[PDB]
Amino acid sequence: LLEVPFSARGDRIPDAVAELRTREPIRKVRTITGAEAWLVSSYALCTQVLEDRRFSMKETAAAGAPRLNALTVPPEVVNNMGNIADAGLRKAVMKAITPKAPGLEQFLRDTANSLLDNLITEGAPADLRNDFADPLATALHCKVLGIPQEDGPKLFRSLSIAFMSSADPIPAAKINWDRDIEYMAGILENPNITTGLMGELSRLRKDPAYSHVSDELFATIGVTFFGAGVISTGSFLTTALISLIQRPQLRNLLHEKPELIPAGVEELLRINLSFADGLPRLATADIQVGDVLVRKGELVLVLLEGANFDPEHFPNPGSIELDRPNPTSHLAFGRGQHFCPGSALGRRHAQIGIEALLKKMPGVDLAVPIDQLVWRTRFQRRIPERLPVLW
Numbered sequence: 053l054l055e056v057p058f059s060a061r062g063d064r065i066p067d068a069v070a071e072l073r074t075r076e077p078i079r080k081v082r083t084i085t086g087a088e089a090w091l092v093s094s095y096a097l098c099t100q101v102l103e104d105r106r107f108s109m110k111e112t113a114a115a116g117a118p119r120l121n122a123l124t125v126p127p128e129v130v131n132n133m134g135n136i137a138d139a140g141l142r143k144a145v146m147k148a149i150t151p152k153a154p155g156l157e158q159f160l161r162d163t164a165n166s167l168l169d170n171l172i173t174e175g176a177p178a179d180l181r182n183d184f185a186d187p188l189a190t191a192l193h194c195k196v197l198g199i200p201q202e203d204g205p206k207l208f209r210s211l212s213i214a215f216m217s218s219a220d221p222i223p224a225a226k227i228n229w230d231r232d233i234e235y236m237a238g239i240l241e242n243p244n245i246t247t248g249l250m251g252e253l254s255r256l257r258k259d260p261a262y263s264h265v266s267d268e269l270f271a272t273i274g275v276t277f278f279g280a281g282v283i284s285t286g287s288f289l290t291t292a293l294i295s296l297i298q299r300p301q302l303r304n305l306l307h308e309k310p311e312l313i314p315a316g317v318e319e320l321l322r323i324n325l326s327f328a329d330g331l332p333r334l335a336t337a338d339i340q341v342g343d344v345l346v347r348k349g350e351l352v353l354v355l356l357e358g359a360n361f362d363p364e365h366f367p368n369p370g371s372i373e374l375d376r377p378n379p380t381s382h383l384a385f386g387r388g389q390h391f392c393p394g395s396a397l398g399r400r401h402a403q404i405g406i407e408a409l410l411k412k413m414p415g416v417d418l419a420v421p422i423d424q425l426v427w428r429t430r431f432q433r434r435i436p437e438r439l440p441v442l443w
């Protein structure tokens with residue numbers, strides 16, 4: 053059986069995706085747990101799966117379900133956004149994680165420029181992952197959640213294990229989770245926390261209307277959104293920076309015309325290889341997908357770069373084009389029921405980070421050969437451990 057994932061490299065799509073997409077856009081594969089799954093790799097079939105609610109995210113956590121990887125969190129964390137809705141906490145979460153919050157844009161700006169000024173002061177080479185993108189992501193999310201900036205680095209520490217993509221259960225993941233939860237639970241009891249998502253969650257927790265809502269859930273929300281948001285924005289910006297560095301005339305164009313930076317980031321999103329695995333769903337019924345009858349109880353993996361590099365939807369898919377007619381129609385944020393609630397913020401993080409970097413380091417380039425980057429393995433994202441650059 054063809055094994056997944058194909059490659060841990062986040063800088064280059066494997067040739068085998070284009071071949072697999074045309075001939076077998078749904079194809080049986082084996083996951084690292086040894087489970088069988090259906091890998092879907094065309095825009096047509098990927099959208100089908102994500103729009104069909106009978107292909108369930110929640111049910112991937114069912115006992116004895118075939119698994120893409122080992123659970124690193126309680127089985128109910130996989131249903132976090134549903135739980136959030138059922139508790140009536142939805143539009144509050146959404147309010148907290150909008151990039152439009154007064155002062156947030158300028159905070160991101162000033163934070164980005166300050167990180168860059170420190171790198172320019174220290175001298176090249178600079179590691180843009182550990183000393184720019186990830187610290188930017190972490191700073192942002194502390195702001196968003198209303199927790200102290202100095203607390204960011206320690207919560208960040210859990211993510212190299214929390215977002216592993218493991219064949220086997222991970223002892224450390226439970227230890228870290230319990231500790232982070234305990235942390236968030238204290239944050240909720242802290243009267244000084246009056247801003248951001250945790251400032252809100254804290255005041256809803258006092259109101260007896262929300263007596264039905266557990267303390268586990270409130271604290272879980274904080275841990276979940278921090279980790280998910282920090283890993284995704286930090287990881288996406290890092291590999292987006294590589295794509296940009298490798299396209300000097302695009303780098304030059306955006307530096308000259310910063311108004312095109314949103315169009316550039318949308319393209320960088322479309323071609324991004326940050327998700328290491330397809331998005332998993334469990335079929336809750338027998339459902340036809342292309343030439344395959346997917347059976348109740350079976351795992352399906354939605355390969356985002358399958359869809360995103362599909363020439364049937366995106367002409368010249370390997371090329372970054374700033375004048376595409378339907379540019380936001382990629383699947384980098386998913387589709388349907390579980391479309392990323394952080395997508396607006398994820399955009400602005402990348403847009404502002406890139407704008408800062410292009411202005412401070414207009415001559416940015418890799419300071420090592422591309423084949424020297426060390427790609428993290430058995431992780432839910434594809435990222436280089438370090439991104440050395442000069443300017």
Ligand code: HEM
Pocket residue numbers: 109133134149277278280281282284285288289326331332383384385386387389390391392393394395397398399
């Ligand atoms: C460039 C940045 C980001 C990317 C590429 C990204 C990607 C994704 C994708 C592909 C999904 C759908 C997963 C699926 O359907 O199985 C998703 C869902 C989700 N994202 Fe993001 N995300 C990003 C930023 C963020 C941020 C900033 C946050 C929170 C602050 C966040 C929180 C979430 C949550 C809670 C879900 C689950 C939604 C649900 O189940 O209804 N993401 N994200």
Ligand SMILES: OC(Cn1cncn1)(Cn1cncn1)c1ccc(F)cc1F
Pocket residue numbers: 124125129130131132133134214215276279280284
């Ligand atoms: O954070 C996850 C996964 N995820 C991150 N982006 C898109 N999906 C769960 N997770 C898996 N390993 C560690 N954490 C998550 C977050 C919220 C949610 F509602 C579901 C969900 F699977």
